[PDB]
């Protein structure tokens, strides 16, 4: 899994080397940054339900056809609405993992790999998840570097969906 620490090791191991300052500095930056990342991860976790709930409605608001069109891909039934909120929760939970891990690894591994295939196979619009993510970005209530951290991983997901 891709983290600043595993990337530092991978770089050394690729060349059959022991680790050097060239690599310990990277890891130190990670350790220093963790204070801001952990604030963000905690706040997003603590406020996850209201973020998810808010995000779901933001989607339904922008794309009201998703609440009305017939189809298992849509949130026009209770089961569909439950799957949509689950998915949004997945996204948010992955953001929190990225923050805890200090890198994109968890999202890359658990969510991004396979994403386009899954979205195309199950007829899910990327634009739906982007709206959800834009809501979370807008309303997470973080400021300063904690917000920079959260937004970096949220925008990473948005970019993966574009």
């Amino acid at each position: 899994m891709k983290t600043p620490i595993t990337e530092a090791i991978a770089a050394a191991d690729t060349q059959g080397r022991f680790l050097s300052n060239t690599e310990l500095q990277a890891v130190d930056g990670r350790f220093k940054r963790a204070v801001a990342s952990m604030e963000a991860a905690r706040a997003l976790t603590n406020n996850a339900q209201s973020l998810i709930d808010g995000a779901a409605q933001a989607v339904y608001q922008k794309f009201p056809y998703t609440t009305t069109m017939q189809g298992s891909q849509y949130a026009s039934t209770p089961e569909g609405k439950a799957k949509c909120a689950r998915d949004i929760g997945y996204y948010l939970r992955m953001v929190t993992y990225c923050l805890v891990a200090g890198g994109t690894g968890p999202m890359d591994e658990y969510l991004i790999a396979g994403l386009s295939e899954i979205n195309s196979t199950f007829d899910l619009s990327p634009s739906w998840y982007i709206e959800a993510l834009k809501y979370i970005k807008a309303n997470h209530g973080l400021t300063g570097q904690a917000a920079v951290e959260a937004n970096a991983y949220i925008d990473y997901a948005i970019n993966a969906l574009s």
């Binding site: 620490i5 595993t6 090791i9 191991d13 050097s20 939970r93 968890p106």
Partner: protein, 172 residues
């Protein structure tokens, strides 16, 4: 490979759960103990050549059969490969120390290693001895109170000792 942080994330995902307050606290302590970990890695790495060579010398002094003709550590190619292995093990152990998890060591180094030595005729018990020597040296160097801001690194030394013991167990 995983690191102390990804390890926790991976366990959490398997359950489909957000992190608990307890887990954040644990991981915050890890970050708070980070400087010590960087010193250890630096120190062991900065002395890698002497750790290996002194451990090799000590091994061959205690087990001269390894370097007598007909042995495994006899001939320069076999000697070179032996020293190399000691270097490799020390290397992966230092990765493990940085990561705060053994998955890199286990995965990329330790798995299949017993079977490999068994196929070659290399006595695993001897390798384990070399590992233990490197361990004692690595720890003395890493935990040396001279030239560093005083504090307690004991927990970390035990973790470090754990990676070395793990490696020695894998071959013995």
């Amino acid at each position: 490979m995983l690191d102390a942080f990804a390890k926790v994330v991976a366990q959490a995902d398997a359950r489909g759960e957000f992190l608990t307050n307890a887990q954040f606290d644990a991981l915050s302590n890890l970050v708070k103990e980070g400087n010590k970990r960087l010193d250890a890695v630096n120190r062991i790495t900065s002395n890698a050549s002497t750790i290996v060579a002194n451990a090799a010398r000590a091994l061959f002094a205690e087990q001269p059969q390894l370097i007598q003709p007909g042995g495994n550590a006899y001939t320069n190619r076999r000697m070179a490969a032996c020293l190399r292995d000691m270097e490799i093990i020390l290397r992966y152990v230092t990765y493990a120390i940085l990561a705060g998890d053994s998955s890199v060591l286990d995965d990329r180094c330790l798995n299949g290693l017993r079977e490999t030595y068994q196929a070659l005729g290399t006595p695993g018990s001897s390798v384990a001895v070399a590992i233990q020597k490197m361990k004692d040296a690595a720890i003395a160097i890493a935990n040396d109170p001279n030239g560093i801001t005083p504090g307690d690194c004991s927990a970390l030394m035990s973790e470090i000792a754990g990676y070395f013991d793990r490696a020695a167990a894998a071959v013995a």
